[PDB]
Design a protein around this ligand. Structure first.
Ligand SMILES: CN[C@@H]1[C@@H](O)[C@@H](O[C@@H]2[C@@H](O)[C@H](O[C@H]3O[C@H](CN)[C@@H](O)[C@H](O)[C@H]3N)[C@@H](N)C[C@H]2N)O[C@H](CO)[C@H]1O
Ligand SMILES: Nc1ncnc2c1ncn2[C@@H]1O[C@H](CSCC[C@H](N)C(=O)O)[C@@H](O)[C@H]1O
Ligand SMILES: [Ca+2]
Length: 309
């Protein structure tokens, strides 16, 4: 079972964690792997080689934080390292559904793609709903005065805090709780890699929570969004005969009454028995003329071709 390991960033001082993050930046994803990179790839490593790379302080920080365990003659990690978009990120390894713990954390299935879709603006306060590993909060940190990540998964909150500390971030904080309950005030930026995929209307688990998590999200967006702000959502969308997703969405958002502008970029789609349709896409609220517009943009295909678009 993968996804239940204990993660305790509070056991390591800020400087040591930043130093481990600097060490990860040097080697994670590099062509010449080092013991630290091997460790964060799932390979057991010789602790003496590790000590020479990250120091005795660093070695102990790996243990104290839960980034590594001493198996006896080797160190191993339950987590996997990533370097993307100027940040380093730990998350769970990508593993089949049947072996995931209740508190398994999105192993960055779509994060790299989603960061490339995100608008380059900045502002005052940003909110990452369902922050998971924290990855999207990390990239927002440069251009928002404050970034708040929220998750109902307490292990995600700890891992997000660890990742913020690895990257040396000061303005990124995380809170455990249910949707907007821990997010006070208004935000100029809200991002949400939503836990929706093939489950339709019914909650399965924290990574496939059902259409009701989108309903809660969009019903509360207007009272949580600063005027002229931006909302960005990765979501699965189910169209049923006579009952398209976009109509329920407009109702949740109060879209016309609030004068919001919304665009849905549909990338993937699968026709369903009934002639309805399943879609995966990217939903944006941004300043513009009131209304909802739907466009086809196969950004998954383009991304597989060449990410730099
Ligand atoms: C936070 N939003 C995410 C959302 O981005 C979406 O992610 C999808 C992944 O699930 C899927 O992974 C599946 O195939 C893997 C092997 N390739 C197995 O290892 C995984 O276990 C197995 N689940 C990816 N191949 C494609 C992704 N689009 O759906 C998530 C809920 O399922 C949802 O929470
Ligand atoms: N009711 C709820 N409130 C807050 N987060 C929730 C929630 N229900 C599910 N989630 C969280 O939504 C997250 C989606 S996975 C996305 C993680 C990260 N933003 C990334 O892009 O990689 C999960 O961590 C899951 O625990
Ligand atoms: Ca599952």
């Amino acid at each position: 079972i993968v996804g239940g390991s204990t993660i305790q960033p509070e056991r390591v001082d800020a400087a040591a964690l930043r130093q481990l993050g600097d060490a990860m930046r040097k080697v994670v994803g590099s062509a010449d792997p080092t013991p630290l990179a091997d460790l964060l790839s799932g390979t057991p490593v010789d602790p003496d080689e590790l000590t020479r790379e990250v120091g005795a302080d660093g070695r102990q920080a790996l243990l104290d934080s839960g980034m590594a365990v001493d198996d006896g003659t080797t160190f191993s990690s339950p987590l996997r390292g990533h370097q993307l978009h100027g940040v380093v990120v730990l998350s769970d390894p990508d593993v089949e559904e049947e072996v995931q713990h209740r508190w398994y954390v999105d192993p960055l299935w779509e994060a790299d793609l989603l960061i490339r879709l995100m608008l380059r603006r900045g502002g005052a306060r940003a909110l990452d709903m369902g922050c998971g590993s924290g990855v999207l909060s990390l990239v927002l940190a440069d251009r928002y005065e404050s970034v708040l990540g929220v998750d109902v998964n307490p292990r995600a909150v700890a891992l997000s805090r660890l990742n913020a500390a690895l990257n040396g971030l000061t303005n990124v904080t995380f809170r455990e709780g249910d949707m907007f309950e821990p997010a006070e005030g208004r935000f100029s930026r809200i991002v949400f890699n939503s836990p929706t995929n093939e489950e339709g209307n019914e909650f399965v688990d924290l990574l496939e929570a059902g259409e009701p998590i989108l309903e809660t999200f969009f019903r509360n967006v207007p009272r949580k969004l600063e005027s002229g702000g931006i909302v960005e959502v990765n979501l699965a969308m189910n169209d049923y005969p006579g009952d398209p997703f976009r109509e329920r969405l407009a109702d949740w958002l109060g879209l016309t009454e609030n004068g919001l502008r919304v665009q849905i970029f549909t990338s993937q789609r699968r026709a369903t028995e009934s002639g309805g349709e399943w879609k995966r896409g990217w939903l944006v609220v941004a300043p513009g003329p009131v209304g909802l517009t739907e466009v086809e943009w196969p950004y998954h295909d383009r991304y597989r071709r060449d990410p730099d678009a």
